Amino acid sequence: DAELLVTVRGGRLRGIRLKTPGGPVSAFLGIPFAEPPMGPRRFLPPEPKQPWSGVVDATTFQSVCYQYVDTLYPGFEGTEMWNPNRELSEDCLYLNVWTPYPRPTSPTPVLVWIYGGGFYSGASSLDVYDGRFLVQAERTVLVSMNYRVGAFGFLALPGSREAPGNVGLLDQRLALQWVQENVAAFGGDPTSVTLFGESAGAASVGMHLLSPPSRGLFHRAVLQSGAPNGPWATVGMGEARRRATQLAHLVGCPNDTELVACLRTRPAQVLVNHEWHVLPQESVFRFSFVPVVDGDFLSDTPEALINAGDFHGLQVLVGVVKDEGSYFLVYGAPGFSKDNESLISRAEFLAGVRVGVPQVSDLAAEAVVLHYTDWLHPEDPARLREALSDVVGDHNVVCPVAQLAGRLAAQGARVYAYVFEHRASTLSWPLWMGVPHGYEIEFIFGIPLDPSRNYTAEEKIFAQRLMRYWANFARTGDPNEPRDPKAPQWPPYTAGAQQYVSLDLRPLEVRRGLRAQACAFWNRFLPKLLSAT
Amino acid sequence: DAELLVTVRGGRLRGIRLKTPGGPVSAFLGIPFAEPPMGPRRFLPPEPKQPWSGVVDATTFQSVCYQYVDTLYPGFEGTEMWNPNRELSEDCLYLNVWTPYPRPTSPTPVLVWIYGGGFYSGASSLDVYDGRFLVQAERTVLVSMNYRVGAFGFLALPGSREAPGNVGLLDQRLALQWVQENVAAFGGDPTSVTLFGESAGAASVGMHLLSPPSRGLFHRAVLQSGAPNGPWATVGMGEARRRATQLAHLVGCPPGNDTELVACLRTRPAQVLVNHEWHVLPQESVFRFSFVPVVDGDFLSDTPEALINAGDFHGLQVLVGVVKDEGSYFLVYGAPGFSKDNESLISRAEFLAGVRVGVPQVSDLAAEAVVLHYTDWLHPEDPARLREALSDVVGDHNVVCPVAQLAGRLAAQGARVYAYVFEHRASTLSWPLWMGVPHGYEIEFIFGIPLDPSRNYTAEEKIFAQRLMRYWANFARTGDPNEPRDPKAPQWPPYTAGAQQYVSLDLRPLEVRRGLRAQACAFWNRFLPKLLSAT
Ligand SMILES: CCN(CCC/C=C/n1c(=O)cc(C)n(CCCCCN(CC)Cc2ccccc2[N+](=O)[O-])c1=O)Cc1ccccc1[N+](=O)[O-]
Ligand SMILES: CCN(CCC/C=C/n1c(=O)cc(C)n(CCCCCN(CC)Cc2ccccc2[N+](=O)[O-])c1=O)Cc1ccccc1[N+](=O)[O-]
Ligand SMILES: *[C@@H]1O[C@H](CO[C@H]2O[C@@H](C)[C@@H](O)[C@@H](O)[C@@H]2O)[C@@H](O[C@@H]2O[C@H](CO)[C@@H](O)[C@H](O)[C@H]2NC(C)=O)[C@H](O)[C@H]1NC(C)=O
Ligand SMILES: *[C@@H]1O[C@H](CO[C@H]2O[C@@H](C)[C@@H](O)[C@@H](O)[C@@H]2O)[C@@H](O[C@@H]2O[C@H](CO)[C@@H](O)[C@H](O)[C@H]2NC(C)=O)[C@H](O)[C@H]1NC(C)=O
Ligand SMILES: *[C@@H]1O[C@H](CO)[C@@H](O)[C@H](O[C@@H]2O[C@H](CO)[C@@H](O)[C@H](O)[C@H]2NC(C)=O)[C@H]1NC(C)=O
Ligand SMILES: *[C@@H]1O[C@H](CO)[C@@H](O)[C@H](O)[C@H]1NC(C)=O
Ligand SMILES: [Cl-]
Ligand SMILES: [Cl-]
Ligand SMILES: [Cl-]
Ligand SMILES: [Cl-]
Ligand SMILES: [Cl-]
Ligand SMILES: [Cl-]
Ligand SMILES: [Cl-]
Ligand SMILES: [Cl-]
Ligand SMILES: [Cl-]
Ligand SMILES: [Cl-]
Ligand SMILES: [Cl-]
Ligand SMILES: [Cl-]
Ligand SMILES: [Cl-]
Ligand SMILES: [Cl-]
Ligand SMILES: [Cl-]
Ligand SMILES: [Cl-]
Ligand SMILES: [Cl-]
Ligand SMILES: [Cl-]
Ligand SMILES: [Cl-]
Ligand SMILES: [Cl-]
Ligand SMILES: [Cl-]
Ligand SMILES: [Cl-]
Ligand SMILES: [Cl-]
Ligand SMILES: [Cl-]
Ligand SMILES: [Cl-]
Ligand SMILES: [Cl-]
Ligand SMILES: [Cl-]
Ligand SMILES: [Cl-]
Ligand SMILES: [Cl-]
Structure with a gap:
């Protein structure tokens, strides 16, 4: 019909009508927001996609950026749900837009989802990131992008103009600029953009908080199980150059400009096959190519920018899951396997x-x-x-988040903290892993509402509950329902009281201390x- | 009576019949076990008391060794109860013996008590150390002694024949030799001597464990709220000399040099040395004392921590424990914002x-x-x-963790170890409520002071003290506190390095617990x- 045709600043698009049990949603999947970063443009910052002729087939997800594929447990849903579901390509800088089927007459707020994967993997086309239920239920505009991961997005020879690093973050920023200029054509409100992401996506959200050129592109932030001050999320210029030169050696390509130009001659898959081989030791919850503290995107370390920063006028929603580092152990720790106790x-x-x-x-x-x-x-x-x-969980996720929440709140921000502690009825991981890293996303995105999945009906209520918490934060900066002050109130997190909420099948429960005794050791x-x- | 006259190897003694609600006890108070360490014999090891003519008036407590007196809270009971209750004199090397009035026909085990007080205070003549009720109710011989404290017993110039250090411990050893020679004259069995002490007294007990010449003078040991491996109980030869030369400086003794420095100290009056005692401490401290045993290579061959890891401990019954609030009351002696009257x-x-x-x-x-x-x-x-x-x-760093460390190494090397935690606050307690059960307030109940009629203890505090005296006496006899053939009683299990089992001591029956502040002592130890x- 006519609701599936929209025109943005670069050309015409043709979307697709998606079906939800509670109605339909208009979806535009695979909108180009950058010229394909290939050949000489590998390792480079992205160029805005020049205008195009005709209409773009925006009815399906575009390709996944080149990345390592998990093969530890072949055919096992606990790992396959994160692997790519489209073909790999360096032609992958595309974004998606969900909007309610009766396109909103009034400007509705916007959620922008940035995926995780240790800056080495991830795709907006994953099934758990499907935003049809989150839009149909709460009537917001949801945008999700693809950003370059691995060496293609974060290989850095600091100082050189050919491998400047942090280009995957610059992919995200370019997508945010696209939202500022084009989400209005879908009903979105460019003055209510709420970033939310998980793992490296949450750490990415923290980067844009500390980067001034990104600060005017969004208004509030949600950091799920991730923070930029984590030990895994950033690397120094010295180690970044060490890891890049180590890769060029392993691939046969060893000044700076000579090194990069050779790397652009290797097929993308050849670099991917040597990714994990540039790490300084046998480790878990460490990734090769991550954002670099270089002086451009980050004037200083994320830790330093956090302390000296003024965050008045900022609303932040942060949280962790019950068992963050449980399934990381089966990827190198002695005596661990998903198949025994x-x-x-x-x-x-x-x-x-x-x-x-x-x-x-x-x-x-x-x-x-x-x-x-x-x-x-x-x-x-x-x-x-x-x-x-x-x-592993406290050192890498919990204590970095708790350190950020206390600093943000005690320096102007309004912070709301949670601990997601519901183990899904469909979870394929062993029971000793509890609620592992990343298994709150299904409920944030209302995946239980999908009829083809056998979530309990009580879990569907849980999903719609969490969807309202997130939409309420997106609209107002406060997850609470201003409608019902009889329901248990979600108080702000503060450096002193350290109040947070437990998210499970039970009603809200206020707890104190986000592993305060353990995080005093780490931080x-x-x-x-x-x-x- | 005939029971109040006895002949010791040094001469004759005239004793006293003491009164208890349950019966009488013979007691011989003020027996001279050493020649007075005065004048030129100050700072020197003790010499055996020369035999005397006639009888000795063993009817009243002798003097108290020269020591600091706690003038911090004048007239306060909790403070004054430890202050010396006899005349101060360097002539203080005397001991006391309690024995049941029907003098035991059979050889009975002996309990030897060593008082505490940071090696700077204490006396056997205190009211809390009265041996009537323990000897009457359980029929064991009890002995206590006075040993030199402060600089008089522990001033050390390592390497000099004039101030060789640890002479206060040599006082204790001489008393133990006296017990070996003479406790038989009171019904005591020289082959069943159990040492028990508290605070620096318990530390002294553990040091007799680590000093071989003392090892043939007892068979069992009880350490109450003290350990030889504490941070306060020992001091290095370098620091020991540094503290002693400073004391000489502070009394106008111009710093062979060592022979001159001690001789000048021998001239200054006793109270002058006491006045400048706490000034040789290196900095602001609590639970830290100036003149303590020195690791000189003689009495202590090595640091107590070293002597404990590789010792001769197999076939040794040891009783060990702490109170629930070991460090509370120390804080009022220097910690900012603390007072007994305040909150x-x-x-x-x-x-x-x-x-x-x-x-x-x-x-x-x-x-x-x-x-x-x-x-x-x-x-x-x-x-x-x-x-x-x-x-x-302060409680863990100084008492609990050194004690748990001792109990573990003893057990792993073949010692039968029993551990307790005393967690009953006395109704008579003069200290504030927030101090809980403070350091030293299990002694009253171990000695059966609740049985004194002039005291206002609970009727249940009376059956409590009679149960503790039973535990201590059973240990002195057998090396096991619980009753020999007792079906219905919560059995007291031995302490081990793995299970780490101990019992709680209060009005409630024996509650068996595991872990003697294990998470905290892992940090300290x-x-x-x-x-x-x-x-
Ligand atoms: C044993 C011989 N091999 C070893 C490589 C195999 C293992 C790679 N390895 C690590 O060593 C360490 C880590 C931490 N990890 C990341 C795993 C985290 C979980 C992934 N998780 C999906 C559940 C994704 C996710 C989803 C959502 C949010 C966040 C995240 N997240 O955070 O990832 C690893 O994968 C060497 C070799 C030798 C010759 C040729 C090729 C290779 N070679 O290299 O294969
Ligand atoms: C209830 C009765 N209790 C006594 C409590 C024990 C508490 C320790 N206590 C004292 O008793 C007395 C005093 C005076 N103080 C303070 C001395 C330290 C300050 C020196 N400071 C000044 C800047 C440093 C300095 C000095 C001079 C020059 C330069 C510098 N400098 O460099 O700064 C204490 O701490 C006896 C007891 C009874 C039974 C069993 C065990 C014990 N028992 O005792 O365990
Ligand atoms: C629990 O599993 C771990 C994981 O390793 C193995 O698990 C088995 C179920 C099997 O599928 C095997 O292929 C898998 O690698 C066990 O640790 C392993 O033990 C074997 C010896 O039996 C070693 O050869 C492996 O190197 C070692 N793996 C690691 C990562 O150290 C573990 O023994 C097993 N049992 C227990 C009680 O943990
Ligand atoms: C708790 O009490 C202590 C000391 O306790 C006593 O101190 C006496 C001087 C006397 O006033 C008596 O009534 C009191 O109970 C207090 O410590 C001292 O407080 C004063 C007040 O300013 C300071 O000048 C001292 O420096 C300080 N001594 C220290 C720090 O060693 C303490 O203030 C008090 N706390 C309260 C009342 O909250
Ligand atoms: C780095 O690469 C090679 C390594 O030897 C070196 O010759 C480059 O210098 C040349 O510099 C010229 C000046 O701009 C340039 O025009 C030329 O392209 C370049 N050579 C190559 C092969 O690229 C070094 N370039 C630097 C240091 O910028
Ligand atoms: C449960 O879900 C799986 C896949 O999600 C499906 O194959 C199966 O039929 C479902 N079970 C039932 C009873 O519908
Ligand atoms: Cl569909
Ligand atoms: Cl056209
Ligand atoms: Cl499987
Ligand atoms: Cl509307
Ligand atoms: Cl260059
Ligand atoms: Cl820009
Ligand atoms: Cl950082
Ligand atoms: Cl090292
Ligand atoms: Cl600061
Ligand atoms: Cl505010
Ligand atoms: Cl299972
Ligand atoms: Cl508080
Ligand atoms: Cl709580
Ligand atoms: Cl409280
Ligand atoms: Cl508490
Ligand atoms: Cl904790
Ligand atoms: Cl700090
Ligand atoms: Cl009397
Ligand atoms: Cl005489
Ligand atoms: Cl005669
Ligand atoms: Cl020396
Ligand atoms: Cl022995
Ligand atoms: Cl020194
Ligand atoms: Cl305790
Ligand atoms: Cl009180
Ligand atoms: Cl039993
Ligand atoms: Cl175990
Ligand atoms: Cl267990
Ligand atoms: Cl503990």
Whole structure:
């Protein structure tokens, strides 16, 4: 019909009508927002997509940016749900727009979703990122982009104009500029753009908070299980150049301009096959090509920008899942597998500490062991497994988020914190993993409402609940319903009270302290210990 | 009576019949076991008391060794109860013997009590150490002694024949030799001597464990709220000389040099040395004392920590325990914002400064680690938690963790170890309520002081003390506190390095618990030394 044809600043589009149990949604999938970054444009910042003739087939997702594919458990849904579902291509800078079927007459707020994957993987075309239910239920405009991952998005030879780094973040920013100029044609309100992302997508959201050229592109932010001040999310110029030159050596390509020009001659798959080989040691929850602290996108380290920053006028929604680092362990930690109880020995535990906490002195590992050992049950395998699951989760996700939330709130921002702790009825991972990293996204996106999936009807109510929390934050900067002050109130997170909410099948429950005892070790004591040994 | 006259190897003695609600006891108070360590014999090891003509008036307590007196809270019971209740004199090397009035026909085990007080105070003539009710109710011989304290017993110029150090411990050893020679004359069995002491007395007991010449003088040991491996109980030869030369300087003794320096100290009157005792301490401290046993290579061949890891401990019954609030009352002697009359709700800025006075001579990084473990980062400002937290800091760092460390190594090397936690607050307690069960207030119940009619203890505090005296006496006889053939009684299990089992001591029956502040002592005993030798 006529609702599926819209015209943006670059040309004409033809969308597709998507069906929801509660009605239809208008979807425009695979809108080009950048000229294909190929050949000489590899490793380079993106160029805005020049105008085109005719109409663009916007009825299906475009290609996935080149990335490593998980093959640890072949055919296992717990891993396959994150693998690409389209063909790999460097011609992948495309975005998507969902909008309610009766296109909103009044400007409706906009959610922009930035995906995770340790800056090495991810695609907006994944099924758990389907935004038809989130739009049909709450009547907002949802936008999701693809950004270059791996060396294609974050390889950096700092200083050189040919490999400047952070171009995957610049892909996101260009997509945000596109929203400022074109979301109005879909009913979106360019004055109510709320960024929300998970894992590296959440860390990416934190980057745009600390980057002035991005700050005028969105108004509020949601950081799900990720923060830019995490140990995995940023790398120094010295190590970034070390990892890039190590890749050029492994691929046969060893000044700076000579190095990059050779790398552009290698097929994209050839670089992907040597990605994990540039890491400085055997580790878990570490990724090769991540944003670099270079002085452009980030004037300083994310930690420094966070402390000295003024965040008045900012509303932030942050949170974690119950068991963040559980499934990371099966990717290199001794004695761990998704297929047994992973009841590890203490020798395996002490060895696993060095894998979860790499590039760290022997004394600091002793400090980690002292805090996470039950010295009445130092050998109990079950306690030891949960301990290492806490070591990885707290060090990489929880304590980075708690450090950011306290700093933002105590420096002008209005922060709301959560802990998603509902294990899905469909979860294919083992039971000892609990609620693993990334398994709140299905409910945030209202995937339970899909009839073809056998979520419990009580889980569908849970999904619609969470969808309202997010939409309420997007509209007002407050997740609470101003309609119903009888329902349990979600209080703001503060540096002192440290109040947060538990999200599960039960009604809201206010808890205090976001692992406050453990995160005092990671954020306060451990830096002093490394700075003195 | 005939029971009040006995002949010891040095001469004759005239004793006293003492009265208890349950019966009488013979007691011989003020027996001279050493020649008076006065004048030129100051700072020197003791010499055996020369035999005497006629009888000795063993009917009243002898003097108290020269020591500091706690003038901090004049007339306060909790303070005055430990202050000396006899004339101060350097002529103080005397001991006392309690024995049942029907003098035992069979050889009976002997309990030897060593008082505490940071090696600077204490006396066997205190009311809390009265041996009537323990000897009457359980029919064991009890012996206590006076040993030199302060600089008189522990001033050390390492390497000099004039101030060789540890002479206060040599006083104790001489008393134990006297018990070996003479306790048989009172019904005591020289082959069943059990040492029990508290605070620095318990530390002394553990040092007799680690000193071979003392090892043939007893068979069992009880350490109450003290350990030889504490940070306060020993001192290095270099620091020992540094503290002693400064004392000579502060009394106008111009600093062979060592022979001159001691001879000048021998001239200054006794009270002058006491007045300048706490001034040789290196910095602001709490639970830290000036003149303590020195690791000189004689009495202590090595550091007590070293002697404990590789010792001769198999076939040794040891009783060990602490009170619930070991460090509470120390804080009022230097921690900012603390007083017995106040409620001591300190600010965090006072907590941080009080940490560095309870844990002195540590790096700033070490103090940061203490703050990390003992802060409640969900309520880091609450003055009520900060008050209890600094109590735990001083309590763990000085008593609990050194004691748990001792119990573990003894058990792993073949010692039958029994551990307790005394968690009953006395109704008579003069200290504020927030101090809980403070350091030293299990002694009254172990000695059966609740049985004194002139005291206003509960009727249940009376059956409590009779149960503790039973535990201690059963240990002295058998090396096992619980009753021999007792079906219905919560059995007291031995302490082990793995299970770490101990019992709670209060009006409620024996509750068996595991872990003697294990999470906290892992920091003090394991990680903190690594961090201290890596900065
Ligand atoms: C054993 C021999 N092999 C080893 C490589 C295989 C393992 C790669 N490996 C790691 O070592 C470490 C880590 C941390 N990880 C990331 C895993 C995280 C979970 C992924 N998760 C989906 C559940 C995705 C996700 C979804 C949502 C949010 C966030 C995330 N997220 O955070 O990822 C790894 O994959 C070497 C080799 C030798 C010759 C040729 C080729 C290779 N070679 O290299 O294959
Ligand atoms: C209830 C009775 N209790 C006594 C409580 C023990 C508390 C320790 N306590 C004291 O008793 C007395 C005093 C005076 N103080 C303070 C001395 C430290 C300050 C020195 N400071 C000044 C800047 C440093 C300095 C000085 C001079 C020059 C330069 C510098 N400088 O460099 O700064 C204390 O701490 C006896 C007891 C009874 C039974 C069992 C065990 C015990 N028992 O005792 O355990
Ligand atoms: C639990 O599983 C781990 C994971 O490793 C194995 O798990 C098996 C179920 C099997 O599928 C095997 O192919 C898989 O690799 C076990 O650790 C492994 O133990 C084997 C020896 O039996 C070693 O050869 C492997 O290197 C080792 N893997 C790692 C990562 O260390 C583990 O033994 C098993 N049991 C327990 C109690 O943890
Ligand atoms: C809790 O009490 C302590 C000390 O307790 C006593 O101190 C006496 C001087 C006397 O006033 C008596 O009534 C009191 O109970 C207090 O510590 C002292 O407080 C004063 C007040 O400004 C300071 O000048 C001192 O420096 C300080 N001594 C220190 C820090 O060692 C403490 O303030 C008090 N706390 C309260 C009342 O909240
Ligand atoms: C880096 O690459 C080679 C390595 O030897 C070196 O010759 C480059 O210098 C040349 O510089 C010229 C000046 O602009 C340029 O026109 C030329 O293209 C370039 N050579 C090549 C092969 O690219 C070095 N370039 C630098 C340092 O900018
Ligand atoms: C459960 O879901 C799976 C796939 O989501 C489907 O194949 C199966 O038929 C469902 N079960 C039922 C009873 O419908
Ligand atoms: Cl469909
Ligand atoms: Cl056209
Ligand atoms: Cl499977
Ligand atoms: Cl509308
Ligand atoms: Cl260049
Ligand atoms: Cl730009
Ligand atoms: Cl950072
Ligand atoms: Cl700061
Ligand atoms: Cl190292
Ligand atoms: Cl165990
Ligand atoms: Cl268990
Ligand atoms: Cl505000
Ligand atoms: Cl399972
Ligand atoms: Cl809570
Ligand atoms: Cl915690
Ligand atoms: Cl700090
Ligand atoms: Cl009397
Ligand atoms: Cl005489
Ligand atoms: Cl005669
Ligand atoms: Cl010397
Ligand atoms: Cl023995
Ligand atoms: Cl010194
Ligand atoms: Cl306790
Ligand atoms: Cl508080
Ligand atoms: Cl509270
Ligand atoms: Cl509590
Ligand atoms: Cl009171
Ligand atoms: Cl039993
Ligand atoms: Cl503990």
